Amino acid sequence: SPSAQELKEQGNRLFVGRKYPEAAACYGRAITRNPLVAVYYTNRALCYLKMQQHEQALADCRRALELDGQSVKAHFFLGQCQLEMESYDEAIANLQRAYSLAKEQRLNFGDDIPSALRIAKKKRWNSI
Numbered sequence: 001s002p003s004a005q006e007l008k009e010q011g012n013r014l015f016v017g018r019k020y021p022e023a024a025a026c027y028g029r030a031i032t033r034n035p036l037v038a039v040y041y042t043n044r045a046l047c048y049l050k051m052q053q054h055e056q057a058l059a060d061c062r063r064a065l066e067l068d069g070q071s072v073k074a075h076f077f078l079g080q081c082q083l084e085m086e087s088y089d090e091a092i093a094n095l096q097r098a099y100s101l102a103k104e105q106r107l108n109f110g111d112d113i114p115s116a117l118r119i120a121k122k123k124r125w126n127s128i
């Protein structure tokens with residue numbers, strides 16, 4: 001029987017291979033072993049976003065945030081999901097929160113978060 005961490009790594013590898021439902025199922029098996037690890041929910045949320053399952057992605061972000069309020073990924077994925085759902089004000093605030101958390105945690109995503117913010121703010125401006 002695989003361990004929870006082995007299933008998380010298998011899901012991560014399947015995600016790199018663009019096998020999104022298969023990766024999401026691996027994270028579900030990891031959650032069966034240990035449902036108190038935020039990263040299983042953040043990683044599954046991005047799978048759901050890639051599968052256009054926005055409501056399921058939002059729910060996994062909420063499960064992750066109840067376990068790790070400092071999660072850069074949960075805020076970033078929540079913001080990207082809200083952007084796709086046209087919830088622009090919410091998306092921008094979550095992306096800005098991911099930026100602040102990433103800076104406080106010394107995480108390096110290059111210019112991804114400011115670029116995502118401009119994409120979100122430009123899309124918001126174009127809609128209004």
Ligand SMILES: CN(C)S(=O)(=O)C[C@H]1CCCN(C(=O)c2c[nH]c3c(F)c(F)c(F)c(F)c23)C1
Nearest residue numbers: 012015042043046047072073076098109112113
């Ligand atoms: C499903 N999983 C295999 S996963 O681990 O969620 C895979 C992710 C790993 C990190 C990089 N990925 C990204 O999509 C990011 C690209 N830019 C980011 C960024 F600026 C962030 F703030 C952030 F939180 C991110 F996750 C990303 C993939």
